[PDB]
Amino acid sequence: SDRVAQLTIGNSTITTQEAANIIVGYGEWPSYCSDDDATAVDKPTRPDVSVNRFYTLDTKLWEKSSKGWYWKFPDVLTETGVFGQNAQFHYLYRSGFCIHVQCNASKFHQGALLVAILPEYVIGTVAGGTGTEDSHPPYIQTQPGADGFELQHPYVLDAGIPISQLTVCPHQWINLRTNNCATIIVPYMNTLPFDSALNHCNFGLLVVPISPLDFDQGATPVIPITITLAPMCSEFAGLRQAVTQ
């Protein structure tokens, strides 16, 4: 009654029969902006079906020597579907997300992942190596899009913060002896109630193998990791022509 689930929203459902449990980030569901909070005076659009779908984005192969990946949300979906068309026309934006990452393996493979969220995941550099040149990260390390980006130094998460206490932020583990998926429901976290969808990326989805993959030779050596996400309770405002960046 906990191992088996089904998440239907929009026209797309996903079934899982070896889940762990759904955690709701910071204990509350995504919701619409109340009139106590809103400052924009134009009526928002709320598509309510066409953008609240599980978008399956990409597939990272996980071998025995991987480091970890990250996806900046919502810039994984400003190139995809009716979410990517409404977020490019409209200046303002708010939504929550239901984030579901699948990674199946046999009952002989082993290894654990820490799929975790963290809001305002800013990216530092190696500062020129020795630490004296103020190098800023490029635009693709900042906002990789639906392609994702691989961590260089996952012990410090490319930001000088340790991964050992990433477990404070909303997370759950995918260890291949127990579960194969990890649902994380995230509300809209930001100070101001709407923001731009092209500039500001509210959070980043860190997916790091902490305990590495291991399997005896003869088993299937290709163990993919696919993340599917669904913008919940999304609404846009401030209509103008299409910007792409």
């Binding site: 002989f108 654990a112 477990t167 305990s211 590495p212 399997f215 005896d216």
Partner: protein, 48 residues
């Protein structure tokens, strides 16, 4: 201290070396007092 009580047994085809991740926190009767500055100082020179 962590001791093997019986063994770690595997079939043929399973990896004979597994890894334990140690998580740690406090209970609900945990309190602290008399706030001070931390022992590591995260600065060597002038922060430019």
């Amino acid at each position: 201290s962590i001791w093997y009580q019986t063994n770690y047994v595997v079939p043929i085809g399973a990896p004979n070396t597994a890894y334990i991740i140690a998580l740690a926190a406090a209970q609900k009767n945990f309190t602290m007092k008399l706030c001070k500055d931390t022992s590591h100082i995260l600065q060597t020179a002038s922060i430019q």
